[PDB]
Amino acid sequence: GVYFNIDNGFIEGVVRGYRNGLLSNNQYINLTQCDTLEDLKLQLSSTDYGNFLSSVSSESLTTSLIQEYASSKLYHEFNYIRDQSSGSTRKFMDYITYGYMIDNVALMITGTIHDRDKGEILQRCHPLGWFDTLPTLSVATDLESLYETVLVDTPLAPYNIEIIRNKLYKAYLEDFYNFVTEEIPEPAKECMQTLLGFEADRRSINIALNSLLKSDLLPNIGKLYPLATFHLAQAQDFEGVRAALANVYEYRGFLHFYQLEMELCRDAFTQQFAISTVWAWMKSKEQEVRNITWIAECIAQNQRERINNYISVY
């Protein structure tokens, strides 16, 4: 790891400085005792968020507003790191956003197939995956038409609505699996094969869990590709997938997906000359912008029973 700090030294030093802004398990105990959104704003400014709500009023402080200012503060940091990267890392951070724009073309089709507005639907769309053709999504509702018309110029071009979603997403995750084993060096090889495999795991389990052929729409890059793909392909009931998921020692008893993700993410920061840190920060800060939102929904309406479901390993 003597060549990493050439192009990725300032990059990793600032990403490792962003994971100290991940507010810890003591930083939620004092943050779950507010009962008003103003008070939460008052003591969220002491963190490394650092008074990001200094421009909004206090009378009109919506629950969503905190969800989108904290995510805008996430996403400006992401494309702050992204436009400072070399050709082995600018691609890797683009391949992070390629799985986001699949969830954006999956939502633009299922929003434009029904009677809905472009502007209102566009607001919900995730802004890291955003190509210039994505605001259209209205030339045709046919799946075949979209590829030639609108997806031909995208970087989704080498890759019914959920059927073409998993058809894009499996070929994406296969192409993202054999990229991180080709051009990314040794301390992030074992990371971007295991962490990525986990993402293939909890998507392939959600295939059979949402289906209750299926062998072509399931990604095969993880630990369930050789053995559990055939057992999970012919599972028609919940007990068939419950018996098929017992073969893996790391997934037995789970059928708890994000808790296993965050525990697999806290070991990703244990390496310190790897580029798996920026994925661990992205999924950790995207975790703690839905932890803050889960707390602020229990504060906006008084739901004091189910607050302690936030999950922080860092």
């Binding site: 004092n30 008052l42 200094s54």
Partner: peptide
């Protein structure tokens, strides 16, 4: 003390909303 119970914070929040 919790940072929202310092017994002047309702008099700082009202002139932070003036400096805002």
């Amino acid at each position: 003390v919790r940072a929202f119970q310092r017994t002047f914070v309702n008099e700082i929040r009202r002139l932070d909303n003036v400096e805002r």
